[PDB]
Design an enzyme around this catalytic site. Structure first.
Site, mmCIF file in Angstrom:
data_model
loop_
_atom_site.group_PDB
_atom_site.id
_atom_site.type_symbol
_atom_site.label_atom_id
_atom_site.label_comp_id
_atom_site.label_asym_id
_atom_site.label_seq_id
_atom_site.Cartn_x
_atom_site.Cartn_y
_atom_site.Cartn_z
ATOM 1 N N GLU B 61 0.812 -1.327 -0.155
ATOM 2 C CA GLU B 61 0.127 0.077 0.010
ATOM 3 C C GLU B 61 0.960 1.236 0.020
ATOM 4 N N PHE B 123 -10.886 -7.056 14.653
ATOM 5 C CA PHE B 123 -9.706 -7.602 13.745
ATOM 6 C C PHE B 123 -9.533 -6.560 12.548
ATOM 7 N N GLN B 124 -8.292 -6.279 12.467
ATOM 8 C CA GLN B 124 -7.714 -5.547 11.461
ATOM 9 C C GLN B 124 -8.300 -3.937 11.663
ATOM 10 N N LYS B 173 -17.097 -0.804 6.867
ATOM 11 C CA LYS B 173 -17.779 -1.984 5.821
ATOM 12 C C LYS B 173 -19.267 -1.990 5.762
ATOM 13 N N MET B 495 24.571 9.744 0.857
ATOM 14 C CA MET B 495 24.342 10.961 1.574
ATOM 15 C C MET B 495 24.665 10.786 3.043
HETATM 16 C C1 LIG Z 1 18.461 15.147 0.571
HETATM 17 C C2 LIG Z 1 17.680 16.439 0.191
HETATM 18 C C3 LIG Z 1 18.328 17.728 -0.061
HETATM 19 C C4 LIG Z 1 17.656 18.853 -0.260
HETATM 20 N N1 LIG Z 1 18.325 20.070 -0.604
HETATM 21 C C5 LIG Z 1 17.561 21.008 -1.031
HETATM 22 C C6 LIG Z 1 18.265 22.282 -1.902
HETATM 23 O O1 LIG Z 1 19.297 22.457 -1.767
HETATM 24 N N2 LIG Z 1 17.464 23.291 -2.297
HETATM 25 C C7 LIG Z 1 15.883 23.107 -2.152
HETATM 26 O O2 LIG Z 1 15.427 23.989 -2.854
HETATM 27 N N3 LIG Z 1 15.508 22.098 -1.801
HETATM 28 C C8 LIG Z 1 16.180 21.118 -1.166
HETATM 29 N N4 LIG Z 1 15.515 19.996 -0.651
HETATM 30 C C9 LIG Z 1 14.101 19.869 -0.731
HETATM 31 C C10 LIG Z 1 13.568 20.899 0.528
HETATM 32 O O3 LIG Z 1 13.452 20.058 1.481
HETATM 33 C C11 LIG Z 1 11.831 21.232 0.115
HETATM 34 O O4 LIG Z 1 11.123 20.268 -0.096
HETATM 35 C C12 LIG Z 1 11.832 22.187 -1.022
HETATM 36 O O5 LIG Z 1 12.872 23.115 -0.946
HETATM 37 C C13 LIG Z 1 10.555 23.001 -1.082
HETATM 38 O O6 LIG Z 1 10.472 23.510 -2.164
HETATM 39 P P1 LIG Z 1 9.221 24.598 -2.364
HETATM 40 O O7 LIG Z 1 9.104 25.541 -1.549
HETATM 41 O O8 LIG Z 1 9.159 25.128 -3.806
HETATM 42 O O9 LIG Z 1 7.862 23.733 -2.259
HETATM 43 P P2 LIG Z 1 6.752 23.268 -1.316
HETATM 44 O O10 LIG Z 1 7.344 22.520 0.090
HETATM 45 O O11 LIG Z 1 5.535 22.430 -1.752
HETATM 46 O O12 LIG Z 1 6.218 24.619 -0.710
HETATM 47 C C14 LIG Z 1 5.231 25.584 -1.828
HETATM 48 C C15 LIG Z 1 4.757 26.767 -1.224
HETATM 49 O O13 LIG Z 1 4.095 27.482 -2.001
HETATM 50 C C16 LIG Z 1 2.640 27.510 -1.609
HETATM 51 N N5 LIG Z 1 1.709 27.045 -2.903
HETATM 52 C C17 LIG Z 1 1.204 26.061 -3.360
HETATM 53 N N6 LIG Z 1 0.464 26.333 -4.288
HETATM 54 C C18 LIG Z 1 0.207 27.523 -4.355
HETATM 55 C C19 LIG Z 1 -0.594 28.514 -5.408
HETATM 56 N N7 LIG Z 1 -1.275 27.966 -6.118
HETATM 57 N N8 LIG Z 1 -0.091 29.944 -5.163
HETATM 58 C C20 LIG Z 1 0.412 30.187 -4.189
HETATM 59 N N9 LIG Z 1 1.385 29.663 -3.298
HETATM 60 C C21 LIG Z 1 1.262 28.219 -3.295
HETATM 61 C C22 LIG Z 1 2.504 26.273 -0.534
HETATM 62 O O14 LIG Z 1 1.413 26.770 0.306
HETATM 63 C C23 LIG Z 1 3.991 26.322 -0.213
HETATM 64 O O15 LIG Z 1 3.948 27.466 0.990
HETATM 65 C C24 LIG Z 1 16.218 18.827 -0.463
HETATM 66 C C25 LIG Z 1 15.529 17.772 -0.082
HETATM 67 C C26 LIG Z 1 16.091 16.537 0.161
HETATM 68 C C27 LIG Z 1 15.345 15.285 0.544
HETATM 69 C C1 LIG Z 2 -6.790 -14.205 8.521
HETATM 70 C C2 LIG Z 2 -6.740 -14.306 10.127
HETATM 71 C C3 LIG Z 2 -7.634 -15.264 10.890
HETATM 72 C C4 LIG Z 2 -7.805 -15.389 12.189
HETATM 73 N N1 LIG Z 2 -8.742 -16.323 12.704
HETATM 74 C C5 LIG Z 2 -8.640 -16.643 14.077
HETATM 75 C C6 LIG Z 2 -8.896 -17.814 14.625
HETATM 76 O O1 LIG Z 2 -9.797 -18.564 13.872
HETATM 77 N N2 LIG Z 2 -9.026 -18.107 16.043
HETATM 78 C C7 LIG Z 2 -8.108 -17.519 16.740
HETATM 79 O O2 LIG Z 2 -7.872 -17.819 17.770
HETATM 80 N N3 LIG Z 2 -7.719 -16.296 16.261
HETATM 81 C C8 LIG Z 2 -7.556 -15.941 14.724
HETATM 82 N N4 LIG Z 2 -7.280 -14.795 14.419
HETATM 83 C C9 LIG Z 2 -6.199 -14.018 15.006
HETATM 84 C C10 LIG Z 2 -7.099 -13.116 16.036
HETATM 85 O O3 LIG Z 2 -7.346 -11.890 15.388
HETATM 86 C C11 LIG Z 2 -6.163 -12.643 17.532
HETATM 87 O O4 LIG Z 2 -5.219 -12.138 16.931
HETATM 88 C C12 LIG Z 2 -6.178 -13.876 18.367
HETATM 89 O O5 LIG Z 2 -7.353 -14.568 18.595
HETATM 90 C C13 LIG Z 2 -5.711 -13.035 19.769
HETATM 91 O O6 LIG Z 2 -5.314 -14.226 20.558
HETATM 92 P P1 LIG Z 2 -5.048 -13.989 21.988
HETATM 93 O O7 LIG Z 2 -6.157 -13.345 22.743
HETATM 94 O O8 LIG Z 2 -4.489 -15.302 22.589
HETATM 95 O O9 LIG Z 2 -3.778 -12.868 21.841
HETATM 96 P P2 LIG Z 2 -3.722 -11.614 22.437
HETATM 97 O O10 LIG Z 2 -4.538 -10.674 21.607
HETATM 98 O O11 LIG Z 2 -2.222 -10.788 22.470
HETATM 99 O O12 LIG Z 2 -4.419 -11.109 23.810
HETATM 100 C C14 LIG Z 2 -3.795 -11.661 24.955
HETATM 101 C C15 LIG Z 2 -4.538 -11.144 26.288
HETATM 102 O O13 LIG Z 2 -3.738 -11.838 27.462
HETATM 103 C C16 LIG Z 2 -3.456 -10.859 28.301
HETATM 104 N N5 LIG Z 2 -2.262 -10.758 28.828
HETATM 105 C C17 LIG Z 2 -1.170 -10.680 28.052
HETATM 106 N N6 LIG Z 2 0.009 -11.038 29.279
HETATM 107 C C18 LIG Z 2 -0.774 -11.481 30.284
HETATM 108 C C19 LIG Z 2 -0.166 -11.958 31.338
HETATM 109 N N7 LIG Z 2 0.946 -12.263 31.601
HETATM 110 N N8 LIG Z 2 -1.174 -12.518 32.478
HETATM 111 C C20 LIG Z 2 -2.372 -12.414 31.953
HETATM 112 N N9 LIG Z 2 -3.002 -11.923 30.850
HETATM 113 C C21 LIG Z 2 -1.941 -11.302 29.999
HETATM 114 C C22 LIG Z 2 -3.713 -9.482 27.314
HETATM 115 O O14 LIG Z 2 -3.832 -8.262 28.019
HETATM 116 C C23 LIG Z 2 -4.786 -9.969 26.331
HETATM 117 O O15 LIG Z 2 -5.931 -9.442 27.182
HETATM 118 C C24 LIG Z 2 -6.910 -14.409 12.966
HETATM 119 C C25 LIG Z 2 -5.996 -13.722 12.415
HETATM 120 C C26 LIG Z 2 -6.038 -13.465 11.022
HETATM 121 C C27 LIG Z 2 -5.088 -12.497 10.411
#
Ligand SMILES: Cc1cc2nc3c(=O)[nH]c(=O)nc-3n(C[C@H](O)[C@H](O)[C@H](O)COP(=O)(O)OP(=O)(O)OC[C@H]3O[C@@H](n4cnc5c(N)ncnc54)[C@H](O)[C@@H]3O)c2cc1C
Ligand SMILES: Cc1cc2nc3c(=O)[nH]c(=O)nc-3n(C[C@H](O)[C@H](O)[C@H](O)COP(=O)(O)OP(=O)(O)OC[C@H]3O[C@@H](n4cnc5c(N)ncnc54)[C@H](O)[C@@H]3O)c2cc1C
Ligand SMILES: Cc1cc2nc3c(=O)[nH]c(=O)nc-3n(C[C@H](O)[C@H](O)[C@H](O)COP(=O)(O)OP(=O)(O)OC[C@H]3O[C@@H](n4cnc5c(N)ncnc54)[C@H](O)[C@@H]3O)c2cc1C
Ligand SMILES: Cc1ncc(Cn2c(C)c(CCOP(=O)(O)OP(=O)(O)O)sc2=O)c(N)n1
Ligand SMILES: Cc1ncc(Cn2c(C)c(CCOP(=O)(O)OP(=O)(O)O)sc2=O)c(N)n1
Ligand SMILES: COc1cc(OC)n2nc(S(=O)(=O)Nc3c(Cl)ccc(C)c3Cl)nc2n1
Ligand SMILES: COc1cc(OC)n2nc(S(=O)(=O)Nc3c(Cl)ccc(C)c3Cl)nc2n1
Ligand SMILES: [K+]
Ligand SMILES: [K+]
Ligand SMILES: [Mg+2]
Ligand SMILES: [Mg+2]
Lengths: 600, 600, 218
Positions: B61, B123-124, B173, B495
């Site tokens: 992602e 979950f998630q 969801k 760098m």
């Molecule tokens: C390793 C590294 C080295 C770097 N060294 C340099 C360097 O030497 N020199 C350098 O320049 N940069 C350097 N940077 C990048 C720097 O950190 C900034 O990202 C960059 O300078 C920002 O450029 P900017 O102000 O033009 O863009 P932005 O950060 O996007 O800022 C744009 C500004 O314009 C405004 N703005 C946006 N849209 C409009 C609009 N329609 N009308 C009016 N205002 C607007 C925004 O609100 C903002 O205030 C480096 C980055 C890295 C990762």
């Molecule tokens: C695709 C998928 C499918 C899943 N399907 C299942 C399934 O079918 N069955 C299943 O079981 N899980 C399933 N899970 C996992 C599930 O989501 C949970 O992660 C899991 O069930 C949690 O197990 P747990 O309660 O033992 O562990 P935990 O989530 O870590 O909870 C442990 C509990 O014990 C407590 N605790 C920790 N330490 C101590 C201690 N020293 N003394 C006392 N208490 C303590 C904690 O505070 C907590 O309340 C699935 C996960 C995925 C990703």
């Protein structure tokens, strides 16, 4: 006078970075996972060529995070992450949220822009304290070097106490570059009974269990947070003659070879375990949080235990360390707050020894017999079934005289690994459960392998999951971690296509990512590659996989569009599950073929 | 009566997902970057086989996020991201923070657990609204399907107005699965003068410029947010005879072939540009935010312009759309709030036409002559110099009758790309500047390539940066995006090693990640691979690279431990820079060799 | 208590759950928790630089605020500085009483409702010594038009704004300090004053000041 005894000047003259280094030593940190950058350079300079811990370099900070997680779950120690400001820090957000959901002790140290530049939208500035607040137990930004040792102690303490979890400590560059000029309280330079309310709860819990005619232990990750946990779990189960089911995260807490094992419960758990908990009059919840994957329809969960509670002859006995998780989902009949292992030491001697439970164990044995993890076996010419693959790996892995640790990605392969491995040892299932992070498998394995250099570490991975973080293969080689990656290649996001087959009439919307050539990939990464394409290569291919003494990537071509079963559909009670049926699968295959015009 | 005219029932009967789909159409979304998952399935089902936009599937992602960023900067349209709950959503946090820092219009749609499950650690489940708050302009969780069209409109509006930036819309969801049963305000089913305070400011600004004897235009990304921006910038520079410097993000806003071009200013900018702005009596800031990479030591920045302001004969004229960035870093003599392009339309006719500035342009031409981007040229037997590589690519790329868009990773290669490319067209430099996210280069290129299918899109990447997200190579192939990746392989985090050479006595602490075999990697990804290892392969290798009509990975072995120069060290004034010197580099090489025992 | 009283003093809140305050301590605690509790050469150099700027000033003014009150020696050192370098003193509303207003060098309060004499003086001063004051919007008036003579002097290297401020957040927040002197204003004055040249008279400056005081009573 005594003021000199309470103050310490031994850190005077050191930079913040050097103080960080010394505090890692005092916290017995032997491994750090991290990636350099401008804001964190003063710390990286201090730990330069340190012989005091192993440094592990990923390719991506998410890798560092998940590695630290794998390390922590394998070792029982906090996983320490060291990253730079801005994107270095935001890249650890998923691992942090992951660690929070799964109760993983993670200590994240993030470089930060100088204090003078904070809040100016500075170069590589992120508000990581604001961002990470929801996905850490606690975080802090160190504002001066004098408080750095205290914040470090505080971080480790919070990460490892209560329910373990992630903490973040933000380290401004000018703080870590600055030199301590003043003495600091000596207590900050060093790391670190039972309430009768709980004691009475325990006695009450014991009396409830001694009445139970259908007890069941529901054991989770919490029992793993103490080395004596599994032992005491077994002692209880043996003494009171109680069947044991575990969560996904509890796998390995109980010897599944034991007749009393009900295997895993929940949505994809054993129908035997699900049936047993639905019929139990007393549920002993040991370090498990009643997650929604486990309970099924909450209102319909554990009917017999709720009835028993109302009639004063059973209920739910919840051993939980975090008050937040007590009575969060289901009402505990008795809440036993604190470390489950410590409280079991008090609990068990109050529990009556029980020789036999003929009627209860007759049901349990009948349920175990009628509810195996059934699936469609291979047929002549067919691809390897993913369930069979897991069995093969499990059988052959148990053959070596080494501990075997399993990590997984997220999806069908994960649930099949959970179901079909035979789990026997604690801290051997290292899987993303609460957040369910695809890509977890490989870096977690690297971390676990570093924690346990003599272990066999197997990443049972999905093709889509593996794609997420496959760059960390180089990291395994550079770290000298001989991990074993098994990619179950069904050429699909299997778990999503299962939901799409089931609920969306086989409309597979963007669930087939193209895969690289995994063998050429492994080669490019300087990793041994093995590809299993047919049934006749399964045994020998898995043996070569496990026999390897170097990092190895095994790709297995497995059957596609195969559902994980049993399944408790959302909204349904735990005992209202879908079971595997051969004819049903045949019909489903025909339907899929027809609807997709033969494409799937 | 009129109530029927103000209410709309055309969405009644549609699911939230279907409504989402329809609103994408109405917002003229032609591309969506995303990845499926349980919580977002109702939306994925709705967009299944949609012919209304192209869907681009990454491997991660973060890839989707950076792709959407690349897309947005190439096209001027918002980049739309569609991900699932939990880790799907937390994985977009770095791209969101990236987009915020660089003013990139990003609209992120994240699946969420059902409303009934929020706050239960489901979950998630991630608190993505809480987490993303600091790194979005705005976010929201949709609570019912009736308000979904309104929230979508609101999201696009906020993302694209003011300073463009990322927004997140959280989609539970059950909301996206639910069906709209009630009519909604018709205004929610559709997308969408000059204040005399500003008008007077403009007149005042013009009078200040008409007095200036040493004007300079300081142009940034803001001038790119209108298609007429570069034209009006040129019109102003031509009319009043003004030298133009740009930021990194402003590159391409001004034709660098024009004699009035001072090239890029800042820490790694031209010493000519830095000298000119330090000596200018009037600075015209056009869409630039005075970032700390640009100003050098703030207290010592623009001395002549501050003097001129105090004497009422110059100063800083800041054309800025976001009030937050007006007077944030440096005091504007006149603040011109609003779109810089629109305000230039009013500004220019009030500005006096100027034929010549003999004395000023004599200094400028002298500064340009004495301050080229000098570096140590190749010698017989030496590796290719990274600066020479960039020149080669720039010269050969300009040869094709196609637009050329450049993305980069982060590090030395990025600054060398900025320095040594000849920038001539707007929206052709797509680089992570504010956050500075390694790994940005490849997915940004894919996004830009999708936005501009007929463009040559070159990712000038570092080896360490490329390692971060190299899995997205498969994504380029699957998307049909014939991107051109050039990895400047110095086998180092260049760098960081530069900072370590400079400030930490050549102590290279964890700054050498092992690289995969990039050619076998490309092969595994089904991508054309080219490797350039010596000077004699440079020209023909780059030609093959650019001539390719398929995705292609070019690896170039380049000289290691080479500093980016010129350099304005932190704490120093913009005109207090380090210049390249041949003998100095020789001595530095000898010193490095001695200190590292010949290792580096 | 530490946070409330250090840096810029301010409010802190400590939330006390009833079961915590009713509960009984059963375990020993670190003894340091049972008890309450030099100058960086960056600042030392800033101070020296500030002194050199003031020693050039022909129209200095002290702009004193609440910060000078946070040390009992504050007003004394303020007076010592004003006396030594012969400097007129204006205060904020919150600085009232930091300087003896009966003293001829008193310009009274500045700002929106302050003395027109004080407001005129700060608008014409070439060197402004900001002592524990945060340039609030009631004090500066139109910020872009604030302290024109001091900004000119800074640009010409003969004056500017010398800001003695304990909180980095309030340094360069509103107006650019020519020299920022971070830390306790009273402590830093102890270092500052001996580097400052003693000045007997400022005929032209104090002629303006006395004329402004006379023409601008309340
Ligand atoms: C390793 C590294 C080295 C770097 N060294 C340099 C360097 O030497 N020199 C350098 O320049 N940069 C350097 N940077 C990048 C720097 O950190 C900034 O990202 C960059 O300078 C920002 O450029 P900017 O102000 O033009 O863009 P932005 O950060 O996007 O800022 C744009 C500004 O314009 C405004 N703005 C946006 N849209 C409009 C609009 N329609 N009308 C009016 N205002 C607007 C925004 O609100 C903002 O205030 C480096 C980055 C890295 C990762
Ligand atoms: C695709 C998928 C499918 C899943 N399907 C299942 C399934 O079918 N069955 C299943 O079981 N899980 C399933 N899970 C996992 C599930 O989501 C949970 O992660 C899991 O069930 C949690 O197990 P747990 O309660 O033992 O562990 P935990 O989530 O870590 O909870 C442990 C509990 O014990 C407590 N605790 C920790 N330490 C101590 C201690 N020293 N003394 C006392 N208490 C303590 C904690 O505070 C907590 O309340 C699935 C996960 C995925 C990703
Ligand atoms: C109706 C009304 C009208 C007003 N009109 C006026 C007016 O005309 N004139 C006027 O002056 N005010 C006026 N105010 C008050 C104005 O709003 C501010 O409250 C006031 O000007 C702030 O004064 P101060 O900067 O001295 O104090 P503070 O706001 O407390 O700021 C003190 C500064 O000194 C710093 N500091 C604190 N301790 C130390 C230390 N030990 N060492 C160094 N620095 C330190 C602080 O961090 C802070 O930056 C008015 C208020 C009201 C209600
Ligand atoms: C980072 C992320 N994105 C999306 C998801 C949603 N998701 C997705 C897209 C899954 C399919 C995993 O595919 P796989 O190939 O790795 O495994 P299987 O084919 O064996 O199911 S599983 C799952 O929960 C996720 N868990 N994590
Ligand atoms: C995700 C992330 N982590 C760390 C950094 C810090 N960092 C690092 C580690 C750089 C080195 C980049 O190595 P490279 O090989 O990609 O490029 P060069 O060798 O050409 O400098 S650059 C830089 O700013 C970053 N910008 N982004
Ligand atoms: C190691 O790679 C790099 C690359 C680099 O600029 C491109 N820098 N710049 C620096 S710095 O001295 O200016 N410190 C710094 C940083 Cl990291 C962020 C924000 C601010 C305001 C500062 Cl003051 N340290 C760096 N390290
Ligand atoms: C597509 O892959 C998957 C895998 C899956 O469980 C492992 N699920 N589970 C579902 S659900 O019906 O239970 N919905 C749901 C989700 Cl996503 C999160 C939290 C809660 C409480 C719910 Cl109710 N949808 C899923 N999709
Ligand atoms: K099993
Ligand atoms: K150039
Ligand atoms: Mg798969
Ligand atoms: Mg490199």
């Amino acid at each position: 006078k005594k003021k000199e005894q309470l103050m310490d000047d031994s850190f005077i003259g050191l930079t913040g970075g050097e103080i960080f280094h010394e505090m890692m030593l005092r916290h017995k940190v032997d491994t750090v996972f991290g990636y350099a950058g401008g804001a964190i350079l003063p710390v990286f300079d201090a730990i330069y060529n340190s012989d005091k811990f192993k440094f592990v370099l990923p390719r991506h900070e998410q890798g560092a995070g998940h590695m630290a997680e794998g390390y922590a779950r394998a070792s029982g120690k906090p996983g320490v992450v060291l990253v730079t400001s801005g994107p270095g820090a935001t890249n650890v957000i998923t691992p942090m949220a992951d660690a929070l959901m799964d109760g993983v002790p993670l200590v994240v140290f993030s470089g930060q822009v100088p204090t003078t530049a904070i809040g100016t939208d500075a170069f590589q500035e992120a508000d990581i304290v604001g961002i990470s607040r929801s996905c850490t137990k606690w975080n802090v930004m160190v504002k001066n070097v004098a408080e750095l040792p205290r914040r470090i102690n505080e971080a480790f303490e919070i990460a490892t106490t209560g329910r373990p979890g992630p903490v973040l400590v933000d380290l401004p560059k000018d703080v870590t570059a600055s030199i301590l000029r003043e003495s600091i309280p000596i207590n900050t330079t060093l790391p670190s009974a039972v309430s009768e309310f709980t004691s009475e709860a325990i006695k009450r819990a014991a009396n409830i269990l001694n009445k139970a005619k259908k007890p069941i232990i529901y054991a989770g990750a919490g029992i793993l947070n103490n080395e004596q946990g599994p032992k005491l779990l077994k002692e209880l189960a043996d003494k009171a003659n109680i069947p044991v089911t575990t969560t996904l995260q509890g796998l390995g807490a109980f010897d599944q070879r034991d007749p009393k094992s009900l295997d895993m419960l929940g949505m994809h758990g054993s129908a035997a375990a699900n049936t047993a908990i639905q019929n139990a009059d007393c549920i002993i919840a040991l370090g498990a949080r009643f997650d929604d994957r486990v309970t099924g329809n909450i209102s319909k969960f554990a009917p017999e235990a709720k009835l028993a509670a109302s009639e004063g002859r059973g209920g739910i006995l919840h051993f939980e360390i975090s008050p937040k998780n007590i009575n969060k989902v289901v009402e505990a009949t008795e809440a036993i707050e604190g470390d489950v292992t410590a409280n079991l030491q008090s609990f068990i001697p109050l529990v009556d020894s029980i020789e036999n439970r003929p009627e209860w164990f007759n049901k349990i044995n009948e349920w175990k017999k009628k509810y195996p993890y059934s699936y469609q076996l291979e047929t002549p010419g067919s691809l390897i079934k993913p369930q069979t693959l897991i069995k093969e790996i499990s059988d052959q892995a148990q053959t070596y005289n080494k501990e075997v640790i399993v990590t997984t990605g997220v999806g069908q392969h994960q649930m099949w690994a959970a179901q079909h491995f035979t789990w026997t040892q604690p801290r051997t299932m290292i899987t993303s459960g609460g957040l369910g992070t695809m890509g977890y498998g490989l870096p977690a394995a690297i971390g676990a392998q570093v924690a346990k250099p003599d272990a066999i570490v197997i990443d049972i991975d999905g093709d889509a999951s593996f794609n997420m973080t496959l760059t960390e293969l180089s990291s395994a080689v550079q770290a000298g971690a001989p991990i074993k990656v098994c990619v179950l290649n069904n050429e699909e996001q299997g778990m999503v296509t299962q939901w799409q087959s089931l609920f969306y009439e086989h409309r597979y919307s963007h669930t087939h990512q193209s895969n690289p050539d995994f063998m050429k990939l492994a080669e490019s990464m300087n990793v041994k590659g093995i590809r299993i394409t047919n049934q006749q290569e399964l045994k020998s291919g898995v043996k070569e996989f496990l026999d390897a003494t170097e990092p190895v990537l095994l790709e297995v071509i497995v059957e596609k569009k195969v559902p994980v079963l049993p399944m408790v559909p959302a909204g349904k009670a735990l005992d209202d599950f879908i079971l595997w049926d051969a004819e049903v699968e045949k019909q489903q295959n025909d339907l899929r073929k027809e609807r997709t015009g033969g494409k799937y």
